[PDB]
Amino acid sequence: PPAGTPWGTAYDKAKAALAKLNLQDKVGIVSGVGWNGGPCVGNTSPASKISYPSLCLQDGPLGVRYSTGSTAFTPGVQAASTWDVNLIRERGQFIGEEVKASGIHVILGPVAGPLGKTPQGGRNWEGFGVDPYLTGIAMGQTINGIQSVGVQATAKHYILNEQELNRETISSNPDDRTLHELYTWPFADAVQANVASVMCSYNKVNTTWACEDQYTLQTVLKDQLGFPGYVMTDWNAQHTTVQSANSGLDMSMPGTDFNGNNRLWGPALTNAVNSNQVPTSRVDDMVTRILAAWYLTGQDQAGYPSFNISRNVQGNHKTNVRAIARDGIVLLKNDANILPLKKPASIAVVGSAAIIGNHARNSPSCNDKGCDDGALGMGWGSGAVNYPYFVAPYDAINTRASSQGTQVTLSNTDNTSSGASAARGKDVAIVFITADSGEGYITVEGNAGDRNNLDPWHNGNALVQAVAGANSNVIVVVHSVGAIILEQILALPQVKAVVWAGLPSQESGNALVDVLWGDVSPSGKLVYTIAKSPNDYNTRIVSGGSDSFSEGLFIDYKHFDDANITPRYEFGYGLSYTKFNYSRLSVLSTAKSGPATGAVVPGGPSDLFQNVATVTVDIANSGQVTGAEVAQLYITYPSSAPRTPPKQLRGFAKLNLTPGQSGTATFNIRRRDLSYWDTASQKWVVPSGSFGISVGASSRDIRLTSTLSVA
Numbered sequence: 001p002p003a004g005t006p007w008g009t010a011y012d013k014a015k016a017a018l019a020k021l022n023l024q025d026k027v028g029i030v031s032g033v034g035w036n037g038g039p040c041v042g043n044t045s046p047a048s049k050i051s052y053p054s055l056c057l058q059d060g061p062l063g064v065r066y067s068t069g070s071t072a073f074t075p076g077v078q079a080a081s082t083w084d085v086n087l088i089r090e091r092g093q094f095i096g097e098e099v100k101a102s103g104i105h106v107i108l109g110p111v112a113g114p115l116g117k118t119p120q121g122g123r124n125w126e127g128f129g130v131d132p133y134l135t136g137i138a139m140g141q142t143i144n145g146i147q148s149v150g151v152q153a154t155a156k157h158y159i160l161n162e163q164e165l166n167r168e169t170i171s172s173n174p175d176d177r178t179l180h181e182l183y184t185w186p187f188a189d190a191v192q193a194n195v196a197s198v199m200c201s202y203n204k205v206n207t208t209w210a211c212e213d214q215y216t217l218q219t220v221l222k223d224q225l226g227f228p229g230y231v232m233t234d235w236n237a238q239h240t241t242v243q244s245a246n247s248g249l250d251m252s253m254p255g256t257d258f259n260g261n262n263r264l265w266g267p268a269l270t271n272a273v274n275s276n277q278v279p280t281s282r283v284d285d286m287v288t289r290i291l292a293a294w295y296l297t298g299q300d301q302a303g304y305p306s307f308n309i310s311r312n313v314q315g316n317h318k319t320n321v322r323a324i325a326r327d328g329i330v331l332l333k334n335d336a337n338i339l340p341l342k343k344p345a346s347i348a349v350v351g352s353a354a355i356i357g358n359h360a361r362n363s364p365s366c367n368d369k370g371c372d373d374g375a376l377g378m379g380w381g382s383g384a385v386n387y388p389y390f391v392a393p394y395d396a397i398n399t400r401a402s403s404q405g406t407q408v409t410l411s412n413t414d415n416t417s418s419g420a421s422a423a424r425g426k427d428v429a430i431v432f433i434t435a436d437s438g439e440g441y442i443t444v445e446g447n448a449g450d451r452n453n454l455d456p457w458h459n460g461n462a463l464v465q466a467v468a469g470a471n472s473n474v475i476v477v478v479h480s481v482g483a484i485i486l487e488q489i490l491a492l493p494q495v496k497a498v499v500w501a502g503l504p505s506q507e508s509g510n511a512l513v514d515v516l517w518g519d520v521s522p523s524g525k526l527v528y529t530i531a532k533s534p535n536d537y538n539t540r541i542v543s544g545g546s547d548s549f550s551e552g553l554f555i556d557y558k559h560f561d562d563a564n565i566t567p568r569y570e571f572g573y574g575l576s577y578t579k580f581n582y583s584r585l586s587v588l589s590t591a592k593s594g595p596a597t598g599a600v601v602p603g604g605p606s607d608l609f610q611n612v613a614t615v616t617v618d619i620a621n622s623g624q625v626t627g628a629e630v631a632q633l634y635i636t637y638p639s640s641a642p643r644t645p646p647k648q649l650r651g652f653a654k655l656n657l658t659p660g661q662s663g664t665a666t667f668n669i670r671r672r673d674l675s676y677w678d679t680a681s682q683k684w685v686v687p688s689g690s691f692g693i694s695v696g697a698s699s700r701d702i703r704l705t706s707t708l709s710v711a
């Protein structure tokens with residue numbers, strides 16, 4: 001790592017601190033005390049000689065876990081659905097503040113793995129959607145936000161943990177280009193934003209456990225992407241004392257298995273070094289990397305608060321949760337201006353997802369959010385936290401509707417008769433369906449982490465059907481961990497509006513009325529494809545020992561485009577209460593063909609992240625109300641290049657505009673954004689020829705097109 005740069009400075013302090021330490025101090029730095037051995041989710045032994053504390057590591061990606069005075073931030077997937085980097089950075093900042101104040105050094109997040117290739121994947125919601133570019137930017141933005149507050153971030157999970165089923169035994173075996181150009185891409189962005197830490201995943205990669213694999217840890221992440229920080233195991237994801245240490249692993253978390261066995265480091269590592277099974281330079285390096293993180297985030301300095309998880313650290317962070325839950329809502333359908341609602345006489349609200357249930361209550365049965373009872377705000381597993389409060393859709397609708405004279409009828413179960421009765425007669429009927437998933441150690445309603453199917457939960461399809469048979473103007477509201485097939489719902493001519501609310505967390509109700517009554521126009525867009533049929537997707541949750549990743553670069557919309565399948569709603573699709581005009585598309589480039597030539601800095605060869613071209617378009621609010629548009633750039637590579645997905649998202653801007661108001665969206669093209677991983681030459685290459693430039697409101701709603709040349 002070069003000097004003058006943040007990492008370089010930290011390594012100097014890290015090398016200097018290493019001198020004062022014995023082997024006993026070193027292995028205590030790298031060895032977890034055990035499963036629940038300390039007061040945090042993770043803990044290591046302190047080194048008092050350098051005033052290095054017992055390192056406190058905690059879940060997770062959306063806030064402080066097991067805390068009684070904490071904010072439950074929206075899942076990453078909601079943040080990405082805003083398409084708003086400012087809200088994304090803020091979210092990471094706000095998480096970081098609560099982590100410092102609660103006395104935790106390392107937050108175990110955010111998530112780039114799984115990327116999310118299979119809609120049934122139980123953990124995708126924790127991430128940033130299916131596109132490596134968007135997810136990449138969001139990793140960058142989030143990590144800056146988190147670490148600028150003085151807390152350590154963890155890029156997670158490295159790598160290819162794209163399903164929950166047999167995650168601890170299944171092998172992920174993609175070809176080299178798929179590995180570099182798709183799944184690693186977002187991880188580069190993380191390394192480049194100077195991420196403190198990287199978590200290696202539970203799965204195997206080409207038959208080798210991820211936390212024991214020389215090639216992914218050493219050659220690719222550490223060497224090729226120039227990651228100066230440290231790699232920790234997922235909880236009990238280490239299988240060896242010796243092999244893991246030599247491969248590139250830096251930290252054994254949490255130290256033991258749940259029963260307190262399989263202690264492969266610590267005393268065993270003290271043995272291994274003595275026999276020179278593990279050299280000394282290797283153990284020095286781990287401790288270097290670990291301490292350099294502690295120095296990068298300035299956690300040595302001043303009075304870092306002590307671990308107190310009952311501290312009220314919320315503040316006014318709910319504003320970020322409000323904004324993201326609200327601006328992350330996608331409007332899928334809206335016929336005959338049914339929406340926004342403008343003071344109707346009566347409203348029917350139908351569904352168990354409409355009201356407070358066990359999920360929103362932090363119920364003792366519903367541990368780790370391991371249930372889909374009542375209103376839904378997130379998935380389950382390690383990436384869930386407790387709700388400090390929860391605003392149920394019904395309650396927020398009730399207050400607002402009542403205030404303006406509207407009467408409300410509630411049918412708060414999923415019963416079809418009650419649903420239809422409540423609907424019949426009323427001016428509109430709003431019905432609430434869900435779908436849930438999570439980490440694959442909790443089975444909820446038969447779903448062992450990953451979803452069994454892509455249908456609504458609790459017979460949501462029948463409920464919509466029942467209500468539609470009793471009312472002409474139906475609004476369907478979905479809160480979901482991922483794509484749900486919507487063809488049955490859409491077949492009902494009575495269904496006039498669908499609202500893809502996503503995962504809103506604690507501010508569910510408010511965000512929704514924000515959009516429903518049109519205090520804000522919806523501006524969210526999809527970060528994954530909603531298909532007409534489950535069959536149209538090209539990936540499966542794999543039940544055998546191996547996923548060959550043979551689909552390669554072609555996942556979600558890249559498959560849909562290439563095979564010419566028409567989705568119901570495409571990636572980057574989203575409606576608005578107003579509309580927008582695109583004009584004056586311009587393209588400027590100085591990009592040159594050939595391999596990346598810069599030396600390796602955090603993120604890879606130095607030129608890869610530097611801008612080489614710029615694309616411009618003017619967006620004008622041609623509607624009658626204020627609203628934000630997410631203008632998107634898609635790139636088609638030249639015909640000289642190998643088989644590459646036809647369109648590839650390479651930029652996005654969001655512009656908020658009053659009626660008649662115009663603005664310029666600017667897309668900065670980094671070198672990588674025109675590159676592909678040439679496997680033969682083992683380098684990132686920009687191809688020569690003519691690139692296609694597609695600019696529009698989605699991956700499919702292209703409005704203007706042009707070209708970009710390479711010599």
Ligand SMILES: *[C@@H]1O[C@H](CO)[C@@H](O[C@@H]2O[C@H](CO)[C@@H](O[C@@H]3O[C@H](CO[C@H]4O[C@H](CO[C@H]5O[C@H](CO)[C@@H](O)[C@H](O)[C@@H]5O)[C@@H](O)[C@H](O[C@H]5O[C@H](CO)[C@@H](O)[C@H](O)[C@@H]5O)[C@@H]4O)[C@@H](O)[C@H](O[C@H]4O[C@H](CO)[C@@H](O)[C@H](O)[C@@H]4O[C@H]4O[C@H](CO)[C@@H](O)[C@H](O)[C@@H]4O)[C@@H]3O)[C@H](O)[C@H]2NC(C)=O)[C@H](O)[C@H]1NC(C)=O
Pocket residue numbers: 172173174175176177179205206215216642678679680681682
């Ligand atoms: C899981 O396993 C898979 C499968 O192994 C992993 O992918 C593999 O990753 C490694 C890197 O670790 C790559 O190795 C590199 O290979 C290139 C050459 O690549 C070409 O040949 C490949 C093998 O071809 C054999 O088989 C064909 C028939 O199929 C026969 O005709 C041949 O005779 C061979 O027997 C072939 O697989 C490649 O095709 C792939 O890529 C092309 C596009 O390039 C696609 O069209 C295909 O679809 C396909 O995916 C390809 O044609 C070597 O050049 C590399 O060695 C160089 O670089 C090293 C590092 O710098 C260095 O040590 C060497 O010295 C060497 O450098 C030499 O060359 C330089 C540049 O030319 C010179 O500058 C220098 O002077 C020197 O002379 C390297 O060995 C594999 O290609 C790759 N395989 C695939 C299929 O992708 C995957 O990573 C694993 N996944 C995990 C762990 O998650």
Ligand SMILES: *[C@@H]1O[C@H](CO)[C@@H](O)[C@H](O)[C@H]1NC(C)=O
Pocket residue numbers: 306307308309310311312
């Ligand atoms: C933890 O925080 C609470 C504030 O609610 C305080 O009463 C208590 O003293 C703190 N305990 C420790 C050990 O810091």
Ligand SMILES: OC[C@H]1O[C@@H](O)[C@H](O)[C@@H](O)[C@@H]1O
Pocket residue numbers: 041059060108234235382383439
């Ligand atoms: O709770 C600590 C860890 O638990 C594991 O089961 C999960 O896979 C990780 O995402 C999490 O960080």
